[PDB]
Amino acid sequence: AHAASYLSVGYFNGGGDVTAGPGGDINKLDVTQITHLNYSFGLIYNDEKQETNPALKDPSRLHQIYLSPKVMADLQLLPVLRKQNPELKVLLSVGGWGARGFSGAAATAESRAVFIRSVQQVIKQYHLDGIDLDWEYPVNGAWGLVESQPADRANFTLLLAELHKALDKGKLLTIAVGANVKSPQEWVDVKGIAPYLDYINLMTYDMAYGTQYFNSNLYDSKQWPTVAAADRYSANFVVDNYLAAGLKPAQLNLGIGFYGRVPKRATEPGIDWDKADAAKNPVTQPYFTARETAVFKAMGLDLTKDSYFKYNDIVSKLLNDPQRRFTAHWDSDAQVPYLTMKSAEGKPLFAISYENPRSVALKADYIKSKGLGGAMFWEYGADDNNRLAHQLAESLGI
Ligand SMILES: CC(=O)N[C@@H]1[C@@H](O)[C@H](O)[C@@H](CO)O[C@H]1O
């Protein structure tokens, strides 16, 4: 008798991000194409000894949220964005890759209460519709990138319960969660936290690591297979792993990457840790030479440091490379595009996978058939004239 109604939740890197670099121009976003904007990022004042941002080390503000000058300035624009789209909801996302402070903020009644008061204060001062927590990651700490402890799982749940209690009726509380199968298994009590959250944003991307070629494939590739089992990921695999853990699909948004990654397999040996003497018997080897790495370096991507390539830069620099060095392809099983570059020997070398309008629309179709609540994407500043967001809006009937 009636139609479904899907979210499209766009993260926007306004303040700067560890992996994605300096913040974008908020004025370039077409906010009519999204249901929700997660302005990223608020950071957390913290006492982690390895924190290298001196502002966050201010002990008088421990456990509070820090908003940089750009963040403050960008948030002053919300009245203009809301006139542009009076349906739009705007949240602040706190955290992000490499962001410290969650483990300590979560750790005691007193720390949780300071954090929650700071969340309430920020919501009221900037008139936000809610808060998104992007803790990467409870328990695991992204393998030591931020502080962590096993009490993180239970503490997160408590933080979220207390936060849900404190938040005005009508305000949104959401989180982003990782792709890794240990996230729902071990790091985050997804069933326990489900009742406190309006929706959950699945980071179904950043898969182009270890022995895997694709960054955000929907299903596994067969033409370009991942070799080590522990690296074998797809957006669908991740979704299924969260579903097995007891979440209802309508509470989930499928995260979509408006970017690509050069897989680490191109430049670093791929280790299968289930093998005998794993570090000396890599199961994949690097297929880029100085010739391929120099091309990326010349484009401002230093592959010894980062593999991140914005969609708009994929378009302008790779697809539209004047020297025609990159050839576009479609992986039929993974349901995403990828590029190859020609080796000196004449062989296609897998350079990068990403998302284009076709693949975004296929992920939308998957959202509709799997019965997910919507899409989320990282991140709006990387779109090309708002085309991928527009696609999503069209495909989801936003
Ligand atoms: C190096 C680091 O701090 N973080 C992780 C890595 O350890 C992880 O195993 C991989 C997923 O396969 O994702 C990176 O973004």
Looking at residue 54, which CATH number applies to its domain? Answer: 3.20.20.80
Is the distance from CB of 105 to CB of 115 less than 8 angstroms?
yes
Same domain, 77 and 54: yes
Maximum pairwise Cα distance, the chain = 63
Are the CB atoms for 173 and 197 separated by under 8 Å?
yes
Residue 234 near residue 217 (C-beta atoms within 8 A): yes
CATH number, residue 320: 3.10.50.10
Into how many domains does the chain fold? 2
Same domain, 139 and 276: no
**What is the stated resolution of the deposited model, in angstroms?**
1.9
Q: Name the residue of 135, 140, 209, 215 to mutate for ligand 1: max ligand atoms within 8 A of Cβ.
A: 209
Residues 102 and 91 in one domain: yes
d(CA 166, CA 286): 51
Measuring CA to CA, which residue among 233, 234, 224 is closest to residue 329? 224
Phi–psi pair at 74, nearest 5 degrees = -60, -45
Residue 94 pairs in a beta bridge with 42, 133
**Ligand 1 geometric centre to CA of 145 (Å):** 10
Distances (CA, A) of 301 to 247, 269, 305, 308, 312: 38, 19, 8, 8, 14
Helix H or strand E encompassing 102? helix 102-105
Q: Which residues contact 101 (CB under 8 A, 6 or more apart)?
A: 43, 44, 45, 46, 48, 51, 56, 63, 146
Per residue, what are the HEC states of 115-141?
HHHHHHHHHHHHCCCEEEEECCCCCCH
Contacts of 148 (CB under 8 A, 6+ apart): 103, 137, 138, 139, 140, 141
Chain Cα centroid distance, residue 93 = 11
The terminus-to-terminus CA distance of the chain in angstroms comes to: 18
Question: How far apart are the C-alpha atoms of 296 and 312, rounded to whole Å?
Answer: 15
Nearest residue to 34 (alpha-carbon basis) of 71, 110, 88:
88
Domain boundary among 320, 336, 354: 354
Same domain, residue pair 85 and 58: yes
With a CB cutoff of 8 Å and minimum separation 6, the contacts of 316 are 384
Q: Are 85 and 4 members of one domain?
A: yes
For tokens 């898969």, what's the residue? 207
CA distances from 94 to 44, 64, 241, 308, 383 (A): 7, 11, 25, 21, 22
CB 274 within 8 A of CB 227: no
User: 283 and 156 in one domain?
Assistant: no
Pocket residue to mutate for ligand 1, from 100, 177, 206, most atoms within 8 A of Cβ: 206
Nearest CA to ligand 1 atom 10: 209
Report whether 86 contacts 63 (CB < 8 A). no
In the reported structure, the alpha carbon of residue 3 is separated from the centroid of ligand 1 by a whole-number distance in angstroms of: 39
Cβ atoms of 219 and 238 closer than 8 Å:
no
The answer to whether the CB of 297 falls within 8 A of the CB of 303 is yes
The boundaries of the domain holding residue 60 are: 1-257+355-398
CA atoms within 13 A on the CB side of 299: 24
Contacting residues for 264 by C-beta, under 8 A, at least 6 apart: 208, 209, 210, 270, 307
Phi first, then psi, for residue 275 (nearest 5°) are -95, 155
- Helices 387-396 and 357-370 sit at what angle, rounded to 10 degrees? 30
Provide residues with CB under 6 Å of ligand 1: 142-143, 145, 206, 209-210
Residue 146: both structure tokens together: 């931020």
DSSP string, 136-167: S-TTTHHHHTS---TTHHHHHHHHHHHHHHHS
**Could you give the angle at the alpha carbon of 306 between the alpha carbons of 63 and 148, nearest 5°?**
30
Q: Which of 202, 203, 128, 187 is nearest to 153 (CA)?
A: 187
> Crossing angle for the helix pair 235-244 and 357-370, nearest 10 degrees?
20
Q: Rounded to whole angstroms, how far apart are CA atoms 132 and 42?
A: 10
Do 15 and 119 reside in the same domain of the chain?
A: yes
User: CB 238: neighbour CB atoms within 10 A?
Assistant: 25
Residue 271 and residue 251 share a domain: no
Residue of 143, 147, 307 best suited for mutating to test ligand 1, as the one with most atoms within 8 Å of CB = 143
Ligand 1: distance of its center to the CA of 142 in Å?
Answer: 7
Q: Is 285 exposed, middle or buried (0-12, 13-18, 19+ CB in 10 A)?
A: exposed
One-letter amino acid for residue 256 of the chain: I
Pairwise CA distance, residues 297 & 66, whole Å:
33
Query: 243 and 286: one domain?
Result: no
Residue nearest to atom 7 of ligand 1 (CA): 143
User: 3-state DSSP call for residue 95?
Assistant: strand
Q: Do 238 and 150 belong to one domain?
A: yes
* Rounded Cα gap, residues 158 and 151, in angstroms: 11
Distance CA 293, CA 283 (A): 21
Atom of ligand 1 at shortest distance to CA of 144?
Answer: 3
Please choose, from the candidates 88, 366, 94, the residue with its C-alpha nearest in 3D space to the C-alpha of residue 254. 366
Statement to judge: residues 202 and 319 lie in one domain: no
Q: Do 295 and 369 belong to one domain? A: no
Q: What region, left, alpha or beta, does residue 214 occupy, with left being phi > 0 and alpha being psi -120 to 50 degrees?
A: beta
